[PDB]
Amino acid sequence: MNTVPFTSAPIEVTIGIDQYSFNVKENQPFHGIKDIPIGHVHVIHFQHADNSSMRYGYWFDCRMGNFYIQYDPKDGLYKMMEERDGAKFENIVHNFKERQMMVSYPKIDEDDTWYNLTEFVQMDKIRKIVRKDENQFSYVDSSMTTVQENELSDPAHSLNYTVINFKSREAIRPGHEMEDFLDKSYYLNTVMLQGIFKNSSNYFGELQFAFLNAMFFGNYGSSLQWHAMIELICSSATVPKHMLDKLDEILYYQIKTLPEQYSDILLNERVWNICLYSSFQKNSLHNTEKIMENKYPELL
Amino acid sequence: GAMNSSNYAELFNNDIKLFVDDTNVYRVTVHKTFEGNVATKAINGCIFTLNPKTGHLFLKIIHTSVWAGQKRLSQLAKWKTAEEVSALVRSLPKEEQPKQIIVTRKAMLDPLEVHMLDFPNIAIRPTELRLPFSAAMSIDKLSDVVMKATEPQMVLFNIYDDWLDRISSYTAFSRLTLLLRALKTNEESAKMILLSDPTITIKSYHLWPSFTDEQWITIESQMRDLILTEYGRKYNV
Ligand SMILES: C[C@H](N)CCc1ccc(F)c(F)c1
């Protein structure tokens, strides 16, 4: 089990760890988060009491270093810092676990939620979408725009998701105009899976990473990307049967985890009703359709 | 964005544009089979592509062979219209290519947009106007070349005959839309109006009769009477 220690909590904040969250009061004795399952990526995120504007947070993998959180009073946020002196990290963290100053990552043993939300998410691929090579962890917030959104203005602070555009030469073979626009299998399978993502596990990891940036930070452009990657599969007549089965599981847990009160903003009517009812895959996402119908029959 | 009465005059400025109507591309008769079922038989169609400023009409005849063995013909028709508009643009010299193409039905927008990706600098626009170009097949010479064609074929017309010698594009477009609207609402009366007087003739290289300015006013008035009336006969007023 790994540990995210905190230098102190000088400002009142809501702290998120993966799908959990808890309130910390200003200058309450608090020195971090213990018992974090090794082996998964994690996200630790922050919403200040005084300004619900700007959620922000750090994607990280405990195998890639010792990482602590420290409040910066100049830039005014909780920052992720790495302590390379391993023996000193073991000691300060032991010092805090002895004084019982750490909240315990509250995982239920029956619970495979975070696993099933992050199945294909790799820290290596995250770092290619969020470019700040000097750090092993990656910062995201609510207001960060995407590469594609920057085409429609600080590139260092962008989310470099894979650009998907259905009315583009990439997506449409000369002389197959109707065919490829109505049945996107060639964009999905040749251009994207074989050409760019190399495999569907990388496809799925971006898809999942987009959804989670949408849910945790309200990052609008991440939501666009999530729906675009769903749409390209739903809009393809020819998809490997194993991709479909996995997509159905992937979406099922995403829909399950979505807060019911955020569905109005986060879910795109047009995309979902196409996947579930109109498109080639209308009959292939049984679990996703069952939860979408029993939980959000309104959107449909 | 979309075209309407508030930006109506834009059509006669000096930016090359084309209207595209697809309403007569896929045409069928519906009939009963020996078994008492119903079946369609297709007939030849056309794409009506029109420069509103010059009156040039690029009539692309759609021969029924283009449907043999095809499924979902109504959807295919839109895509086949886009493929043929696009080919027409590519055949034109650059200085002749339109800067805007306006579709008369919004369902054409994605099909044409997709076929015209290679022309990022041509705007593909819809319109809110309810233009009566579907009635283009009530013009006898147009209907004739369409129904006689035995193979695909692009025929060129000036839908304004010689009008621009004497009137502005604005006014020639206005006359054309009134004639076509009359044709659409009551083709028989519309046609009686136009040919009643046998001294007025249609010149071999024209589509409409050779009316003097004075006769045109009479004609235009009579077409208005028709359109209001049939709008009465229709809404009882
Ligand atoms: C910023 C200093 N050089 C390190 C102090 C510090 C404080 C709390 C930690 F958990 C940690 F890992 C390091």
Short mmCIF file of N, CA and C and ligand atoms in Angstrom, two decimals, chain A residues 4-8 31 66-70 81-83 88-89 92-93 96 102, ligand 1:
data_model
loop_
_atom_site.label_atom_id
_atom_site.label_comp_id
_atom_site.label_asym_id
_atom_site.label_seq_id
_atom_site.Cartn_x
_atom_site.Cartn_y
_atom_site.Cartn_z
N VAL A 4 0.20 9.13 -0.01
CA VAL A 4 0.28 10.51 -0.56
C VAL A 4 0.30 11.46 0.64
N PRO A 5 1.46 11.78 1.23
CA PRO A 5 1.49 12.68 2.36
C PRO A 5 1.29 14.15 1.96
N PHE A 6 0.88 14.99 2.92
CA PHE A 6 0.61 16.43 2.71
C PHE A 6 1.47 17.24 3.68
N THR A 7 2.15 18.31 3.28
CA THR A 7 2.98 19.14 4.19
C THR A 7 2.07 19.79 5.24
N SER A 8 0.80 20.12 4.96
CA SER A 8 -0.25 20.75 5.82
C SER A 8 -1.45 21.15 4.95
N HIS A 31 -2.32 15.17 7.39
CA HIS A 31 -1.07 14.96 6.68
C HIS A 31 -1.15 13.89 5.60
N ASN A 66 8.02 8.54 -5.08
CA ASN A 66 7.38 9.07 -3.87
C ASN A 66 6.90 10.49 -4.13
N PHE A 67 5.63 10.79 -3.88
CA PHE A 67 5.04 12.09 -4.23
C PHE A 67 4.28 12.61 -3.03
N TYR A 68 4.53 13.86 -2.63
CA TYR A 68 3.81 14.54 -1.54
C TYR A 68 3.08 15.74 -2.14
N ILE A 69 2.14 16.25 -1.37
CA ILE A 69 1.31 17.43 -1.68
C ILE A 69 1.73 18.57 -0.72
N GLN A 70 1.93 19.78 -1.24
CA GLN A 70 2.27 20.96 -0.43
C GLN A 70 1.49 22.19 -0.92
N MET A 81 4.56 17.37 -5.62
CA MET A 81 6.03 17.49 -5.56
C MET A 81 6.58 16.07 -5.38
N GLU A 82 7.76 15.78 -5.89
CA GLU A 82 8.37 14.44 -5.74
C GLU A 82 9.58 14.59 -4.79
N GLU A 83 9.73 13.72 -3.79
CA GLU A 83 10.91 13.76 -2.88
C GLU A 83 11.81 12.61 -3.34
N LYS A 88 14.23 9.52 3.53
CA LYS A 88 13.54 10.61 4.28
C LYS A 88 12.03 10.49 4.09
N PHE A 89 11.52 10.04 2.93
CA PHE A 89 10.07 9.89 2.68
C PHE A 89 9.48 8.85 3.62
N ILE A 92 9.23 10.50 7.25
CA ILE A 92 8.21 11.54 7.53
C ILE A 92 6.86 10.84 7.50
N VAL A 93 6.66 9.93 6.55
CA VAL A 93 5.41 9.15 6.41
C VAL A 93 5.23 8.20 7.60
N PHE A 96 4.12 10.44 10.39
CA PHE A 96 2.67 10.78 10.31
C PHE A 96 1.72 9.60 10.57
N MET A 102 -3.33 10.58 9.00
CA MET A 102 -3.62 10.30 7.61
C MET A 102 -4.96 9.62 7.46
C1 LIG C 1 9.71 20.30 0.30
C2 LIG C 1 10.71 19.64 1.24
N1 LIG C 1 12.11 19.58 0.57
C3 LIG C 1 10.27 18.21 1.59
C4 LIG C 1 9.36 18.30 2.81
C5 LIG C 1 8.34 17.24 2.72
C6 LIG C 1 7.20 17.38 3.46
C7 LIG C 1 6.22 16.42 3.44
C8 LIG C 1 6.41 15.32 2.67
F1 LIG C 1 5.54 14.36 2.69
C9 LIG C 1 7.55 15.18 1.90
F2 LIG C 1 7.67 14.14 1.14
C10 LIG C 1 8.54 16.14 1.92
#
